[PDB]
Design a protein around this ligand. Structure first.
Ligand SMILES: [Fe+3]
Ligand SMILES: [Fe+3]
Ligand SMILES: [Fe+3]
Ligand SMILES: [Fe+3]
Ligand SMILES: [Fe+3]
Ligand SMILES: [Fe+3]
Ligand SMILES: [Fe+3]
Ligand SMILES: [Fe+3]
Lengths: 141, 141, 141, 141, 141, 141, 141, 141
């Protein structure tokens, strides 16, 4: 049973290869400052595409990285930016699956969000997000 | 931050509109038979796209419909076909999120599975799947 | 083994047709504005009757629409109205299943709530509840 | 927002009154035999309406009686009857929420199922179901 | 294989008969004021012993009454009074299973708590705890 | 609000001291053979009272031992015996929280079950139940 | 398949013998004061290694202890210290698994955290952490 | 406060670097046959260390791979081997977290298991496990 074409629509995604590349770059940037993090890349659909649990990363950081990446891709903004939204709209954080805490950054294709990169377990979420941005940076270019 | 094109890939979906069309057709065919079903359309990725709870449908049927659709699109075959696999490999049913019980059917686009339609709560699963096929049949075309 | 009249009671609900009709128009009103949302219709009992996942809706928005619709019908108010109740009873949002965030609006039958319509994923929850109202408006009159 | 009448619909329930005294009857008929059970009454929609945890009942039996009652009303048959269906359709038991094991019995209103009574934690499920019938027997008559 | 005596210990509970009597009176206190609640009795150990779901009670109120009764018995105080603890200790509410919101009240036996009574879904939590207190008030005497 | 006398009832338990001694003996028994297990003592109510995760125990064994203990206490029988009930009543294992697998063994107080001892992750469940019985063997006495 | 040696890394843990010793000590440091607590010891990886439910401990306290111990080891600080971090970072508490509430205290080996000890159920969380420190105090020395 | 060294023990693990290498090798093996799989590496403790979701892999496969990795490392044997155990001990598959289905294969250091590699979503689990073995094979050497 085949659908075509007016009932079809398309979406754009990172390849696994790209997601892995970005994720490993986020680890590597954290490694470079003697930091131990977990990293997640979450699709815009968002299934998780990649997780990496770093050596000596805190046990909480795994799921925390996942949810940051989810939150970033959901609204196409850094979670550090998104946490500022809770001043006016404090129940945004009651939306299931979210974590409004610095360390997730969106990846876009022609403007539109396709993935989030989440990092957790550094001394602060601001440093987390710096490593997440380092992850995004190796794409494409 | 912007990936291009060697680290991007495309995937194909039903529109909400087509998913709703095929869903509501499946209800229609069930109601033609004086039966009360729940119907789910589930993406290949598979997020649920559409649920409809029939009037007077059993309370079990809602989730049952979803997992039938999920199972159909996961392996690109009717759940009645897939249920037959359990004789040789009984532990396939222990894969999370699956239900190996007639009433789920795949939709394809260009050969690849793009959605599953799942029906539950007719007096038996062979009837469920009959209405599932009827929903699929209103695509494309 | 059959029960008789005094120990039976009745309740009132949208038909599936009604709930589908309302949800689809809420999507229709969103896509008019270039907006990509998920819509849920949840019963007073509240099982979910309908979900629709709009093309290009954020992945968080599906569950979010659901809980809004649940929260609206639970208290027979807009969730935007209900969110302001948190100022002096802050632990209302600790009630399981609830999301106190604009985008849910109740549907009534002689004054008593029978359904909720939740929308999520527009630029603001205020816009969500506008499209939620536009869904409720096609009922029916 | 007010719906009128050709997209409203009606459904019939046991009153809480009626469900409570059916549940307490099932307990009392268990305690006739020095037997210590849990009882649940689940609606057709099926929310649970009543639970009672017997003095000295096994810790497993609370949730067990819930699921038996859900299962019985879902298919409008006693769970002892339903259990025997698994010879032909073994994956019926993979439907979420269900327990295909004697101790649940349906209550009807003009013919159509409106509640299930579930009992758990007697020496046998067959004895569970006898107490469950002794629950339903104080209706309506 | 049998423990005795000196590493056995005892604990004290409401009977099911007691707890049902308390639950139904809490309903019937709410019923007199035309209002539509769910009621739970939770043991000190705390398994739930009784739930009753009121006719036309909000779908939220079932779970919510449960957790109120859990919270009351956990600390041997009315939940309205436990909610005031949150000013100086805001993360008491992050303790799993708890709901810090008026409608739960302890029953004691010589001075130590043996069950909680939780009412939810009347127009204020402060009405809920009145009905919970009415539930406890039929014990003794 | 205090209840007296005859709407109270008692129940007998292991003390923590007892439950700990039993559990640590079970570990001791396993480690004597160079076996690495997890051990749980679950009450009759059954809350878990003690868990111990052995040095080098398989990651699965922790929850397994919990459920074996739960199952043994629930029906006042060794889970190895309980597993033989499945031939004639195969859906007993569909009862939530149970694990019908050798390694759980009941503790009694004048004849009535008060705790279960659960051991997992010896090379066989039969060996598990050996260590479970050895843990119970240091009780009372 | 054997990995060696540069794909391999080591980590340090409390033994079960040590973990039980520190947990038991926390218990009877609370029992010296006639207070009734749950104690949990969670590895840095963090699996739970030990739980003890104290005689007459509140039902909330079991899981409360677990998450305190988890929180403490995750950031290698007392949870009384950690809770103060919420003033300028309110959403730290939205990290899954965590409880930011006094009663959890880290154990280190060569400066690096290897376990957390969690106590819940005293009159206050500060008294919990006192007993938790008394647990940790029987190491190493 | 510092534990030392009698209270302390070591465990061996794959580095993240090693786990990623193996996971990517399993994918690359599958992609050579035109097969779209998910891969997971799970520690013996068993946290998941690495997940990769392959392009066009079935949605079920992600968690399936996770549980296969978990199951393999739990008993230090291929899951295809472990599935054969269910003939004699059929309730082994009722152990939480497990999937007794070909596609998981253990990795050892000095003969003791340190990780599992799980692959799901090829034409058969036997082929899954071939790709899993090819993942393991690039370690060490
Ligand atoms: Fe974190
Ligand atoms: Fe069904
Ligand atoms: Fe949303
Ligand atoms: Fe049972
Ligand atoms: Fe409520
Ligand atoms: Fe095991
Ligand atoms: Fe606590
Ligand atoms: Fe699979």
């Amino acid at each position: 049973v085949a659908a075509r074409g007016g009932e079809l629509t398309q979406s754009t995604h990172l390849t696994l290869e790209a997601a892995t590349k970005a994720a490993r770059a986020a680890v590597e940037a954290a490694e470079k400052d003697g930091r131990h993090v977990s990293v997640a890349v979450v699709d815009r659909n968002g299934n998780t595409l990649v997780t990496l649990r770093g050596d000596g990363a805190g046990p909480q950081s795994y799921e925390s990285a996942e949810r940051k990446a989810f939150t970033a891709v959901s609204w196409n903004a850094p979670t550090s930016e998104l946490a500022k939204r809770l001043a006016q709209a404090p129940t945004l954080k009651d939306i299931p699956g979210t974590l409004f805490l610095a360390g997730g950054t969106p990846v876009t294709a022609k403007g539109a969000p396709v993935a989030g990169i989440g990092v957790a377990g550094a001394p602060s979420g601001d440093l987390d997000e710096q490593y997440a941005r380092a992850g995004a940076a190796v794409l494409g270019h």
